[PDB]
Amino acid sequence: LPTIRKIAIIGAGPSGLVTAKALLAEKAFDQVTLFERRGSPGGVWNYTSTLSNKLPVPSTNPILTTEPIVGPAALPVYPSPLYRDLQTNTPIELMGYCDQSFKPQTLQFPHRHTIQEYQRIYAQPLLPFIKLATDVLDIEKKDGSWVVTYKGTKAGSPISKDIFDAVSICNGHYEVPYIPNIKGLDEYAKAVPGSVLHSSLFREPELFVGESVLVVGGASSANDLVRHLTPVAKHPIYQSLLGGGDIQNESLQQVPEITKFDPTTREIYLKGGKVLSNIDRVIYCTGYLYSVPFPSLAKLKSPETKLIDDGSHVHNVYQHIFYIPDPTLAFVGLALHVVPFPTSQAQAAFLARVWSGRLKLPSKEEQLKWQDELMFSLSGANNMYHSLDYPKDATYINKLHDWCKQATPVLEEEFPSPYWGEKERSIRENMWSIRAKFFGIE
Amino acid sequence: LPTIRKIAIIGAGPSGLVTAKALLAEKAFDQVTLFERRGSPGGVWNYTSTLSNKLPVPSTNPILTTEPIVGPAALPVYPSPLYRDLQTNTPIELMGYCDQSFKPQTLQFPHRHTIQEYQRIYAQPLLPFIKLATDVLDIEKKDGSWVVTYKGTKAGSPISKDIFDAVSICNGHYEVPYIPNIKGLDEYAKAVPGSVLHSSLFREPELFVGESVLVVGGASSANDLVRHLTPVAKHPIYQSLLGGGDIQNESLQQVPEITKFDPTTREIYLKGGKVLSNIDRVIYCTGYLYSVPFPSLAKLKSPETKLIDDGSHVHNVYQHIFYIPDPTLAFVGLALHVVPFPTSQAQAAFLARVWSGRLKLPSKEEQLKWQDELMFSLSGANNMYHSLDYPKDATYINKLHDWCKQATPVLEEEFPSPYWGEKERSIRENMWSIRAKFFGIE
Ligand SMILES: Cc1cc2nc3c(=O)[nH]c(=O)nc-3n(C[C@H](O)[C@H](O)[C@H](O)COP(=O)(O)OP(=O)(O)OC[C@H]3O[C@@H](n4cnc5c(N)ncnc54)[C@H](O)[C@@H]3O)c2cc1C
Numbered sequence: 001l002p003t004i005r006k007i008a009i010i011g012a013g014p015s016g017l018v019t020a021k022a023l024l025a026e027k028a029f030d031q032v033t034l035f036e037r038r039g040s041p042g043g044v045w046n047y048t049s050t051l052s053n054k055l056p057v058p059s060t061n062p063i064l065t066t067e068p069i070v071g072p073a074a075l076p077v078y079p080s081p082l083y084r085d086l087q088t089n090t091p092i093e094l095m096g097y098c099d100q101s102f103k104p105q106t107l108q109f110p111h112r113h114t115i116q117e118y119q120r121i122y123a124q125p126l127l128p129f130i131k132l133a134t135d136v137l138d139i140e141k142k143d144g145s146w147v148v149t150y151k152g153t154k155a156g157s158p159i160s161k162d163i164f165d166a167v168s169i170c171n172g173h174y175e176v177p178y179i180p181n182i183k184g185l186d187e188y189a190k191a192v193p194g195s196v197l198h199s200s201l202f203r204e205p206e207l208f209v210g211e212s213v214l215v216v217g218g219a220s221s222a223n224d225l226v227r228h229l230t231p232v233a234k235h236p237i238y239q240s241l242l243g244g245g246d247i248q249n250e251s252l253q254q255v256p257e258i259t260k261f262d263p264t265t266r267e268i269y270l271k272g273g274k275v276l277s278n279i280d281r282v283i284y285c286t287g288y289l290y291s292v293p294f295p296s297l298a299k300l301k302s303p304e305t306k307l308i309d310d311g312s313h314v315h316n317v318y319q320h321i322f323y324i325p326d327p328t329l330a331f332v333g334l335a336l337h338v339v340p341f342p343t344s345q346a347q348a349a350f351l352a353r354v355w356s357g358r359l360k361l362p363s364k365e366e367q368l369k370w371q372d373e374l375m376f377s378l379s380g381a382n383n384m385y386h387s388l389d390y391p392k393d394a395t396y397i398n399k400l401h402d403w404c405k406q407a408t409p410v411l412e413e414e415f416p417s418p419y420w421g422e423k424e425r426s427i428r429e430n431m432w433s434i435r436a437k438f439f440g441i442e
Numbered sequence: 443l444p445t446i447r448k449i450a451i452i453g454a455g456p457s458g459l460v461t462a463k464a465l466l467a468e469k470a471f472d473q474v475t476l477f478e479r480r481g482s483p484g485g486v487w488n489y490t491s492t493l494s495n496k497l498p499v500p501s502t503n504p505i506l507t508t509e510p511i512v513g514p515a516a517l518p519v520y521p522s523p524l525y526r527d528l529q530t531n532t533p534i535e536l537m538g539y540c541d542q543s544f545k546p547q548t549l550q551f552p553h554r555h556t557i558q559e560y561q562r563i564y565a566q567p568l569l570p571f572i573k574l575a576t577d578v579l580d581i582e583k584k585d586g587s588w589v590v591t592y593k594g595t596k597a598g599s600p601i602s603k604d605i606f607d608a609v610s611i612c613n614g615h616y617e618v619p620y621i622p623n624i625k626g627l628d629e630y631a632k633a634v635p636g637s638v639l640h641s642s643l644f645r646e647p648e649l650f651v652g653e654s655v656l657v658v659g660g661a662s663s664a665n666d667l668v669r670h671l672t673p674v675a676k677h678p679i680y681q682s683l684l685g686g687g688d689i690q691n692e693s694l695q696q697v698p699e700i701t702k703f704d705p706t707t708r709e710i711y712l713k714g715g716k717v718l719s720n721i722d723r724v725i726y727c728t729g730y731l732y733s734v735p736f737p738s739l740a741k742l743k744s745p746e747t748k749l750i751d752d753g754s755h756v757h758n759v760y761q762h763i764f765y766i767p768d769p770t771l772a773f774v775g776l777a778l779h780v781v782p783f784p785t786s787q788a789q790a791a792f793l794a795r796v797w798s799g800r801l802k803l804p805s806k807e808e809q810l811k812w813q814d815e816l817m818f819s820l821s822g823a824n825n826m827y828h829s830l831d832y833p834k835d836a837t838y839i840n841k842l843h844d845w846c847k848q849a850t851p852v853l854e855e856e857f858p859s860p861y862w863g864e865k866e867r868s869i870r871e872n873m874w875s876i877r878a879k880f881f882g883i884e
């Protein structure tokens with residue numbers, strides 16, 4: 001319904017917040033409303049000593065409903081995966097929006113305190129636009145608009161409904177855990193309640209002192225955990241790498257992928273015949289699954305209409321933003337292997353100018369071609385669908401920056417579009433080396 | 443045992459941490475060990491979405507054992523009373539240690555994020571000196587030293603014991619809630635599980651939207667809550683002031699003290715015959731009780747030996763620091779109505795020079811006189827025992843600063859002693875006005 005006036009935003013985290021600012025800066029919408037289940041904005045940057053009550057083991061269903069921790073004396077809490085001693089893996093010269101910088105004397109890879117404070121400051125002017133402690137239950141096109149059903153968080157809230165011209169989903173993709181279904185893991189897990197964990201549960205390393213641990217995974221998250229646990233867990237720390245690894249020291253023993261979990265002997269069978277025993281904790285650092293837990297959108301199975309299948313990615317989203325069949329439904333924040341704030345802002349700026357009619361999306365056929373060419377380059381590896389590892393992210397954010405400049409008419413105040421010059425791209429290229437040196441590792 | 447070499451510190455919060463630095467700066471002790479039940483230092487500045495599991499209602503026993511939240515997947519969590527949107531009520535020009543300042547561009551009354559980050563930085567060099575996730579169970583003089591019994595926090599830790607020459611208690615006094623035993627409060631509370639709260643449980647104001655609330659108390663904490671709840675709770679907000687109050691608007695109705703709680707009609711009887719009904723939440727902002735939960739010290743009841751009686755204060759502590767009968771037992775952080783970090787540091791510097799023999803405490807008789815004169819000035823109001831409201835705190839911190847200068851010999855590196863000049867004292871005198879104007883209130 002082209003002339004958009006009432007927009008709904010699902011999520012008040014970094015993505016939803018920059019989406020609101022970009023949208024409001026268009027001066028063309030009469031209503032920009034944000035919905036957030038948490039009592040406060042900032043998404044995951046809301047550190048919680050509280051852990052999830054029940055970790056699905058295994059977890060392969062991207063529809064899984066996030067169950068908050070409730071009590072009679074508190075507001076429902078939605079645990080965040082951030083741990084206590086966490087520090088960014090993204091430099092201050094790159095992370096964060098281009099129109100709000102970090103106070104001087106900030107560490108290059110600061111503690112989450114700094115980023116949580118960052119979000120707080122960024123979100124403040126938007127509090128009157130957000131409906132806090134409110135869970136969006138479903139989203140569907142009814143008649144000529146989108147009907148978003150939502151129940152206020154808090155025991156006894158009544159289910160409510162409101163129509164919108166457009167809807168922007170910024171619900172994040174690090175909530176529903178991904179733990180591959182191995183042989184005998186379910187049983188092994190239920191046998192000893194805290195024996196199997198997922199990165200989303202980690203908080204304080206002191207829990208693992210003296211314990212013999214097995215970290216499964218080889219991505220950044222798993223390597224971080226191996227380092228964090230090195231000074232407390234019993235030596236050596238075991239790590240399961242799909243293809244195995246080269247590190248076999250006294251403190252780190254990389255081993256190949258897992259074959260089976262023997263519940264009766266509690267032995268862990270690794271490919272190649274190697275067997276592990278007396279493992280106090282097994283920690284799955286195998287990431288998450290994308291999720292669109294809204295019945296009206298989840299039922300869509302059709303190749304041309306579906307959004308979610310296995311949770312490896314969100315399908316049918318041109319440029320990772322607009323739902324091809326109906327571009328009044330868009331997503332911001334889907335990007336993988338990027339610098340979240342700048343990339344989400346890049347998408348927001350573009351999204352804003354497209355929904356206010358100051359920019360035109362190419363034909364539906366060409367959008368589908370973009371998708372076709374992308375799928376082909378993935379070679380069956382759909383979980384790389386949204387991945388924009390450098391230089392893809394740089395090219396991408398600069399591509400959106402140049403499409404925005406073409407917006408018309410030119411507003412007196414133009415919501416900024418980030419752009420990565422030669423100096424920025426360089427830092428992004430050696431980002432992990434800059435990080436490694438900063439923390440003295442690798 | 444004068445020549446002190448091995449010192450134990452109970453608590454790794456602001457008080458315990460500055461105590462460690464001061465102690466280690468004396469270069470006279472062979473062992474300075476800190477004990478902390480939490481997995482990390484910083485005391486209350488460890489924000490926790492987690493609330494206490496069972497709020498005693500009423501609460502009048504200062505011996506009450508703090509029960510952490512346990513689970514099989516996490517380290518035991520000791521909930522802190524800090525709420526989500528909290529900002530200091532102490533200016534950056536005054537709070538914080540004199541040898542570590544706030545980064546530039548910090549708000550004068552910053553968010554807890556800033557202070558939590560502050561503590562993190564301050565505590566880092568002390569991590570190797572702290573025994574984390576370890577609860578001290580008891581403290582007693584055995585033979586010629588102090589035997590501190592402690593059990594590692596974490597299911598299945600074995601009870602351990604270690605002897606020390608001196609022990610410094612910095613366990614804080616904002617844990618054990620104080621809720622006066624009124625007529626029919628226990629029953630009224632147990633009838634509807636979340637009907638009665640204490641400030642230590644507050645976290646997110648959105649919980650109280652639409653609810654009719656009664657804040658009981660008139661101190662700073664209660665006024666803060668009244669303001670925080672004004673934009674969400676049903677109007678008006680009720681506040682119970684011991685002597686009643688002058689504000690009776692549409693949003694705030696101050697009423698006199700509570701007489702009885704009628705459990706069958708759930709009506710709240712206020713002195714003067716006024717009666718309240720349909721009160722969804724009653725929130726006690728009546729502070730805390732001091733606590734010395736160590737059997738060997740709690741059993742002491744004697745006028746000349748006792749430490750705790752009703753929890754209104756810690757008795758027999760000269761200058762609020764040294765246990766008169768045995769000055770090898772000291773307390774830091776007991777001060778009330780002060781600026782915590784500077785005041786605790788002031789005491790630490792003094793404590794350090796007294797335990798290393800570079801300063802001499804006056805006779806036992808004179809110490810007891812100091813106490814006698816203090817008790818007399820309190821006029822039965824023992825809960826004002828440690829209160830050093832300006833200008834007492836200024837005079838006090840400057841008094842300790844001048845006694846420290848007299849230490850001998852002069853060390854190459856002297857642990858700083860804070861001093862409040864004319865400029866500092868002025869800010870401390872109008873502290874609440876400076877705060878009121880900063881937040882635009884009063
Ligand atoms: C362990 C960890 C470490 C990280 N470290 C970094 C780092 O160093 N640097 C970096 O750049 N990024 C880091 N990230 C990435 C992080 O995702 C981003 O910084 C940031 O979270 C971007 O968030 P967003 O708004 O897209 O999503 P964030 O209930 O995920 O999320 C969304 C918000 O929408 C809400 N929401 C979702 N669905 C609903 C619904 N149906 N109803 C109501 N509310 C809903 C959520 O509860 C939340 O408040 C890390 C993340 C993790 C988990």
Ligand SMILES: Cc1cc2nc3c(=O)[nH]c(=O)nc-3n(C[C@H](O)[C@H](O)[C@H](O)COP(=O)(O)OP(=O)(O)OC[C@H]3O[C@@H](n4cnc5c(N)ncnc54)[C@H](O)[C@@H]3O)c2cc1C
Pocket residue numbers: 452453454455456457458459477478479480484485486487520523524525529530531532537576577578579612613614615616774775780781782783786
């Ligand atoms: C709601 C609130 C707001 C505040 N706002 C401010 C403010 O704006 N400015 C300000 O200056 N102050 C403020 N304060 C005051 C605050 O007390 C101080 O900033 C700071 O906490 C000083 O702490 P400490 O080390 O003396 O105690 P903090 O388990 O209290 O405490 C002690 C530490 O010792 C540990 N411990 C105690 N007993 C044991 C044991 N037996 N075994 C093991 N560990 C033990 C504790 O668990 C903790 O980690 C506020 C406090 C509250 C509760």
